Design a protein around this nucleic acid. Structure first.
Lengths: 436, 430
RNA sequence: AAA
RNA sequence: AAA
């Protein structure tokens, strides 16, 4: 009945952290980066990471190191689970009792499950670090605390970061009601010296057309002694100061060389510089393309679930005139099932354009514009897909004006546009040709 | 010469009366019925009918009888026109001058066209007797007099009758808002001893759910004393008192035996009691009266349709097919009637002849008359039910899928319509 | 004048 | 972390 008891402990072993096998190397790197450049909860996660890679002994060393720095119950729960897997269950029962004693003394309603806001935050931070699939739960953890202690600085920050990252998933949807602006303001108010939270508020203000006010918080963060640099670089890049951003990123890269986020941002800077020259040399343009591919390729190498970086890679190979590699990466993208499923719209859309312009294959452009549209969630890319589809369909009707398929697709377009009368008119016109 | 002068008179010859050829015998009969049981206008109209029969000499008699009883101008005008066709130019000019002086005396703006409400009414009574193709003009003639004399009793009745008959054409159209109730009420008030108007108000009240108040006018119109029996028989027929309605019709038929309206109402009574081995005696009677009304007025589309439907009751599919085919070749004045023609022929093909294909053809044709009505809805539902039968035996039929999407469009369910249109276009991709 |  |  030890297993039955261990499953009631609140710790990383029972939090159902969604960690894909391919995300394991990157996760470990991101944890270690946090050890140095950002303290108990972080070593607990590192111990769990070490466990999942078959290094229980080295995991205990991270748990024992975590105990040196009520929040101890998570560390005791990981110990219990650890000794269980190692066959040393006699020691596991000890830490089970240490948890029960604290639960007993605090009038906790459960034998081993400690109900308190400290553990709620512990669960939120772990989830917030192990991938976007957990962000809804992570927000719930911090929101649970703020429901009773609305001015709590820790949960106020965790809630704002979670809400901010969830707004990023929906940044391109048409609804686009960003609910993280005020939570961030409150997070900055209750953590006045936390630059990480200040930069996020600035980026969210930049998202809302308030770039000016956002930059004020950017400078305040740069006044305190990689996380500020990596996110500040994004603010400057999107503002236009691409050279300033590249500088901040290369500095941050010295501290955290394995950061896929930095490599991705770095590539986006070179891409921005490639456009600068284009709108204006050839050795410089080819130089930046070769550098952008290098970093996009480095991000996809370290975190192959980085679907978006994989897409910027395939698109950059097009800029380089390397169609065999663009096709190669697009074929990988087409096999994915992104966490943010809306991303698949952009995959199909940009592959549709690739077919339309590089391959001059309107048949396949139509196929992939439809697949992007088949993800019904309204977005900017879905509108572009409907318009591009409308263009090719109209190009096929100016040749063969009685094409059954083109009359159906056009009537389908009008349906998506909300014009139902013209949709029925073309569907009916097509069904008459079908009568043969 | 004198022609351009004749075309300016206001009389039957210049009122563009729309009288189909097949309707001439029934018109002459209804004119004579009015002469005897309902008076200068009817003889003028009677004179015009004779001229159309090729009996110009017979017409001069009815015009001479008319003057024996400013409305004289209509008669004088018909005289002018009658003598022109007969070659008596000098005699026509004599009546042209008689009209010119009256116009001249009354400070009339035109030389021969007399403007006045009396002749506006005379024109209305003529239009109102020569078929429903003229009732819109009739209503206008009477609405012109009320425009400046809102209490004129004559025009108040002519406008109420025209408005009532027009409301009859649109009686089955959806959301039809009758504009004939208050015009009838006013007509009743300004003509208290005219039972004709009273019964019409009762029937219109019966049409508007106020049958109780309507029956009051029925008995009141019957107190003072054939035309009152026609429309009273309808009131009691539609109320359920079929026995009393049959009595009134039989009495009225003795006075005006050639009335197609009476034969039609009789056949409906026999049909009503039928619903409640002896039916053959009843079905044979209803067929005899529908057949009689159609014989006397071939353009009686509605009666011709009740005839075809009764041969179905009699089990004579041969005569039903024959009568329906004559109906299908018609172009009724009330085009909405064509919805019922196709609908009932569609049911005949569906049930009696066991041909859903032709049932579809005709349900569609009834629907293609876009005017919303009761029959159009039944045609959509019949088409729907019928197409669903096709889809239960065979789920992937292109036409059946297209028709079911077309049905949902008519019903206003645009989502289901787009659906079945789409999953049908997928089959079309082969 | 069916409805 | 593209948009």
């Amino acid at each position: 009945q030890v297993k039955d008891s261990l499953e009631q402990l609140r710790c990383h072993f029972t939090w159902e952290l969604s960690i894909d096998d391919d995300e394991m190397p990157d996760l470990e790197n991101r944890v270690l980066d946090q050890i140095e450049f950002l303290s108990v909860g972080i070593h607990n996660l590192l111990a769990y990471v070490k466990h999942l890679k078959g290094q229980n002994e080295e995991a205990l060393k991270s748990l024992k190191e975590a105990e040196n720095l009520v929040r101890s119950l998570v560390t005791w729960g990981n110990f219990a689970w650890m000794y269980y897997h190692m066959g040393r269950l006699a020691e596991a029962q000890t830490y089970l009792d240490k948890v029960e004693n604290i639960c007993k003394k605090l009038s906790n309603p459960f034998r081993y499950r400690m109900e308190c806001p400290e553990i709620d935050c512990e669960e939120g931070w772990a989830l917030l670090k192990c991938g976007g699939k957990n962000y809804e739960r992570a927000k719930a953890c911090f929101e649970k605390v703020l429901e009773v202690d609305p001015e709590n600085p820790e949960s106020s920050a965790g809630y704002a970061i979670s809400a901010y990252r969830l707004d990023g998933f929906k940044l391109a949807t048409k609804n686009h009601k960003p609910f993280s602006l005020l939570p961030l303001r409150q997070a900055v108010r209750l953590n006045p010296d936390n630059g990480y939270i200040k930069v996020l508020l600035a980026l969210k203000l930049q998202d809302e057309g308030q770039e000016a006010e956002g930059e004020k918080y950017i400078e305040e963060a740069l006044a305190n002694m990689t996380y500020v640099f990596r996110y500040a670089a994004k603010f400057y890049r999107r503002k236009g100061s691409v050279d300033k951003a590249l500088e901040l990123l290369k500095k941050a890269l010295q501290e955290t060389p394995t950061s896929v986020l930095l490599h991705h941002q770095i590539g986006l800077c070179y891409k921005a510089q490639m456009i600068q020259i284009k709108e204006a040399n050839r050795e410089k343009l080819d130089k930046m393309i070769r550098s952008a591919i290098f970093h996009f390729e480095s991000a996809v190498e370290k975190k192959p679930t980085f679907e978006v970086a994989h897409l910027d890679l395939a698109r950059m190979y097009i800029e380089a005139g390397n169609h065999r590699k663009a096709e190669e990466n697009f074929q990988k993208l087409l096999c994915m099932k992104p966490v943010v499923e809306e991303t698949m719209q952009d995959i199909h859309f940009h592959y549709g354009r690739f077919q339309e312009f590089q391959k001059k294959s309107d048949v396949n452009a139509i196929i992939h514009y439809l697949k992007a549209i088949k993800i019904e969630q309204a977005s900017l890319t879905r509108d572009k897909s409907i318009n591009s589809l409308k263009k090719l369909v109209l190009r096929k009707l100016r040749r063969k004006a009685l094409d059954l398929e083109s009359l159906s697709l056009l009537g389908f377009v009008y349906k998506l546009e909300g014009n139902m009368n013209e949709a029925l008119e073309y569907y009916e016109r097509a069904l008459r040709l079908a009568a043969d």
